[PDB]
Amino acid sequence: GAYKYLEELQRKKQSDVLRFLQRVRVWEYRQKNVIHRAARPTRPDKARRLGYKAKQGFVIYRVRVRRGNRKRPVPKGATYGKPTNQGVNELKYQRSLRATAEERVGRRAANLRVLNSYWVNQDSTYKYFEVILVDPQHKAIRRDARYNWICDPVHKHREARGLTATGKKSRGINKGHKFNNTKAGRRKTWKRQNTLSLWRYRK
């Protein structure tokens, strides 16, 4: 409906009308700070789809992140090991830019819990994502049983532990033979398979 016009239009991100807006918008975000409060979502369709509700306590942040690989921070490219570890310029930091931005806003609004995030614009040097936050101290969120699971401490800093949407996507956590290597957690999985399980009555 009224949001599917927003949804279906957004599929045509390369369309003539949107190319005007993104180019205008990427200029608008560039001039402002790296992290700044967003008065209202730029994509109210996407936010509601993703769980944002026009309620007091929901916080929206815009963040810009540098693009590209993670240059190995060894001094002057000296790695001091076998030649397979000499590679420095071509390391990929196997965790998404969406996660990297999501950490930074999570640190910025340290009192607060990251729900999810979605990108809004990009260029060659930067990526821009707009981040959804939920306020667990506002009584509107402690009440409202649809959302009071936020108020529990067990999900605090959901963003840093890889419990967010892109975190699960990056951790490789999904069902199938295609994910058997990392199903219950790669490190958790590794420990279980490399454990020598001994019973008192030896088999």
């Binding site: 490399n194 001994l198 008192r200």
Partner: protein, 193 residues
């Protein structure tokens, strides 16, 4: 370090396995703890037998399809045939699973047969009634055993028509092996230029 005639071993012990060795000294301690858990769960819950009624259902994987085993929960179709709605059965201790589908009548009729039997064996306590002592039973699965269906009768007379089972078996495999090959030649031989 290779000695005389001895078999090749592949014992994988070149990582720091010393750090991850779980020796189950707690086997005895865990079993009493579990028996303690079952007892307190039984006393805590109402006089219900610690488990849900599980369907009679065929195993996959022809290595094991010769057998029957308990399923996770009943299909919606089976529960409807019993005369309940799906939500209500879970309240009574009947496990319902939406992922399974019925493509086998004998399995379908077997379940509804045990559904009616279970219904015969229930007293549902009214929400604001008397609730007399019901001599709580511990295991519904023990009360409703799984029976392996009998496939045939003990004795019969042979009806050998000279079928020469290999000629049945070998040609069935030969017919499948060249199956698509035969229609291919149907494409050329019915081409009629």
């Amino acid at each position: 370090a290779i000695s005389k005639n001895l078999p090749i071993l592949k014992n994988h012990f070149r990582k720091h396995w010393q750090e991850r060795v779980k020796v189950h000294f707690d086997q005895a301690g865990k079993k009493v703890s579990r028996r303690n858990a079952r007892a307190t769960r039984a006393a805590k819950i109402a006089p219900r037998p610690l488990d849900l009624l599980r369907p009679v259902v065929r195993a996959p994987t022809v290595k094991y399809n010769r057998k029957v085993r308990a399923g996770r929960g009943f299909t919606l179709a089976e529960v409807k045939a019993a005369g309940l709605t799906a939500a209500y059965a879970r309240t009574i201790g009947i496990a319902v699973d939406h992922r399974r589908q019925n493509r086998n009548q004998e399995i379908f009729d077997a379940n509804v047969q045990r559904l009616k039997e279970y219904q015969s064996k229930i007293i549902v306590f009214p929400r604001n009634g008397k609730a007399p002592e019901a001599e709580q039973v511990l295991s519904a699965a023990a009360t409703f055993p799984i029976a392996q269906p009998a496939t045939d009768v003990e004795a019969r007379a042979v009806q050998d028509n000279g079928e020469s089972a290999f000629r049945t078996l070998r040609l069935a495999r030969s017919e499948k092996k060249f199956r698509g090959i035969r229609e291919k030649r149907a494409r050329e031989k019915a081409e009629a230029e």
